[PDB]
Point group: D2
Chain length 253, copies 4
């Protein structure tokens, strides 16, 4: 019933090597998209691309924090494939700590990819997206919709992405480029599967669905936000969090 | 066939977004129960859908007695309830100083009590199917209007009831979410003047009122497996309206 | 430095017998206000009133859920004292449970005082407030800014108060009546001091300040919102919660 | 004497809301440190206040080296820091397609980095006094603008940094909050045309731009003992702007 939903659409995915990035690549690919799997590292995106239909997936190296590199990537993709239809700004760096536990370097690391990456990839994709009346889906976070204990820089950066999603949706929605985010809770990885049962129980107590988000469940929302069914959704920061942000913060008794 | 043999109960199904939801869910294989107090209108919609896959209920969802009976009779007759769309709603325009106690009672009865009652009496049945609720809230539940004070109170209640019930029941397999439209082309707004409708085109970044089908599309998505990790969300379907900080355009 | 801030202003306080109501009465009284202590029960408001300066405090019986009684109370107060300057809509009923654990009666009990009380007291005070360019402070709740586990009706009612505060502030702010709320976390009572250390520790873990709100701390915000210092604050739902609603819901690790 | 002998560090203190805060805190007995990159302006404000109770620092708060030195020198010289107002800010108008990488760097440097750096290097000193932070965010950090994309990203970062740092440090006795103004009568907006300013009067329910003193009043309140249980709050000082759901007036 979703067969062909993204037939011959060009989807650029940044952070394509991470768990949400791979799940996105596979979901959009299954619905007919041509995927561009953009990431810093080579092995993960190459492996995913080689698993997808011949001629329908390509991998690129990018540092999304480098505006010159990003401009050149977006123009080459549009040149090589004739079009860009969807940008998934899914690159992400996290560092744990308060501002007293994290360095200027930690700030530059988080800000460069999590903020600058969204600004640069959106600014340089937009001329292509305007031609196709395509869209942008930002990977924001639960951590951009309110604060965390012990991730101050990360919360600042994801806060920037949530409000930039709003501002850009106002600037470009009326010219036919819808701009939205997904705000996932912590996604099931092995950088989460590796946590002790004490720690994974504390996360699950706070989520009414009582488990972590699967990456496929976040990908499903990204695909929906890029679909014609989302024609009137613009500037939205969609919580994909099992209820996490629906709480006023009071404990579950 | 996304909703093949799923029983979908839709309040306010005789017109507008409820009708559009009936047609969308019915197209995807649902059996639709169409609840409305507009008897002629909801009968016509039910009769337009595939034989044996649509039934109309003449009901005022403000009436807990009538709501409890409907949800139990539907469950008995069709053996299940999978989806509840709490969509039925009325609007009145004005500040509290320009709208009566009776106006308040009508707004609260349909827009707050209808949602509470329908949720409360559908829930035992949705728990059996790991079904879901989609509330029709509004942009006017996420923030205030000039000149719809009672409506804003009601839709405000719907937005936060969505969150609380999502925490209560999500763990037992019942997702509860809302859609929050801005202006939609329906009977609710077809009497509003061009002066006000034109300013909605300025305040909505997409530059137009929504079609009722564009909101039905999101109701279908929220009831779908692709929304399996969306719970307690008040989804704006507003073209950007609530994304604005309230400021006019800076340039 | 606050001496005289509310000199000869008439402050109507509903739920004047509860802990926030008494703390409000005392705070506004100390700054020169004439207080009207409106509540269902007699003993508490009589005791507070008798503790305050002669001629500067009166107690009334009211059911804020009764629109006829409320209209008559507001007109008699304005008639007797010549003016109303401030309305504190501080009446409150709570019942614990999901919608499956709470009855239609429980819904009518919560809705009548927590919603209807704010609508009725605001509608009937407003003609008086317009004459003095006074204001309204609603006692909303943390529970009106997001959901709780096990208080579904309460969250619906406080949600209504938070958004009604917004709508009314838009309707009346420009005519000189500012309308705001306070959104307290659970306030220290003996209906909280009576809870076991297991249960009070769970509440405190979720509040960065690591303790419950004192009623005086909520009263201080109500007085600020009614002051000339709050001249540009309108339609605001002020969290008085030690950080509770600043959290995205993630656990503290 | 609410701030008698309290050391209050105020960035952007040479003009507008920072200047108004300097005068308000100084009136209530504070010793004010006035940090600004506009040397003439901040010197004039400092010289206008009581002798021995005001000092100007010529600084670009985007520069972490300069910020760390200032906070340590202030603490050494005056023996304490009680309050930090992260107020310094710049604005640029346009979408990302109409504003340059350099524009972004200038906005991010002052509006995001300045706040991060000033907070980070003031904090050890505020922990000693159980002091507080008040950030100047904006209505444009709580929602989006048409035509201020970079500014909205920056103020968005400030709003959520306020929340995270409030959770990190509130327990150690350091409250962190923000004020979120709509239009204020300052150098920042004195170049904006009447067409845009008049529409702010429509979108602000109070019907006027704020005086800078009306925001300084709230900064003083948030640094006061009366705000002892307010933490991680982004307080709108906007006359109702963000209370709106985005809709134009219904009647
Ligand atoms: N149209 C908009 O601009 C807009 C915007 C946001 C939200 N909404 C919400 O959308 C929902 C649907 O409204 P619509 O715009 O499609 O208008 P509509 O008038 O086309 O349809 C509403 C339907 O609800 C029915 N209904 C009303 N009260 C009822 C009751 N007591 N019992 C049973 N049925 C009842 C009506 O008869 C009607 O068929 C409402 O909850 C409304 O508040 C409307
Ligand atoms: N004026 C408004 O409408 C409005 C609305 C909401 C928020 N704000 C915020 O209010 C704050 C104060 O701005 P204002 O309106 O009073 O404008 P202003 O121009 O009157 O004052 C801002 C001051 O900050 C100083 N400053 C700027 N960059 C600096 C830097 N790198 N280092 C040190 N000092 C620096 C400037 O020299 C100036 O003195 C800003 O953060 C602004 O974003 C303004
Ligand atoms: Na998760
Ligand atoms: Na109509
Ligand atoms: Na508390
Ligand atoms: Na200027």
């Amino acid at each position: 019933y979703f067969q062909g939903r993204f037939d011959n659409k060009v989807v650029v995915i940044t952070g394509a090597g991470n768990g949400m990035g791979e799940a996105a690549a596979r979901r959009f690919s299954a619905e007919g998209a041509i995927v561009v799997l953009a990431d810093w590292a080579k092995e993960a995106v190459d492996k995913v691309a080689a698993s997808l239909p011949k001629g329908r997936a390509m991998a690129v190296h990018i540092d999304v924090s480098d505006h010159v590199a990003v401009e050149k990537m977006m123009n080459e993709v549009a040149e090589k494939l004739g079009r860009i239809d969807v940008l998934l700004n899914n690159a992400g760096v996290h560092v744990a700590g308060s501002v007293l536990e994290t360095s200027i370097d930690d700030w530059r690391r988080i800000a460069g990819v999590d903020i600058d990456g969204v600004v640069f990839c959106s600014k340089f994709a937009l001329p292509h997206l305007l031609k196709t009346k395509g869209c942008i889906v930002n990977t924001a976070s639960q951590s951009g919709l309110g604060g965390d204990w012990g991730a101050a820089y990360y919360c600042a950066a994801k806060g920037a992405v949530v409000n930039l999603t709003r501002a850009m949706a106002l600037d470009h929605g009326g010219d036919g480029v819808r701009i939205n985010s997904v705000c996932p809770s912590l996604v099931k990885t092995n950088m989460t599967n590796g946590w002790p049962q004490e720690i994974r129980d504390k996360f699950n107590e706070r989520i009414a669905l009582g488990r972590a988000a699967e990456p496929e469940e976040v990908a499903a929302v990204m695909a929906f936000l890029a679909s014609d069914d989302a024609s009137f959704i613009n500037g939205a920061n969609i919580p994909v969090d099992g209820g996490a942000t629906a709480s006023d913060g009071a404990p579950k008794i």
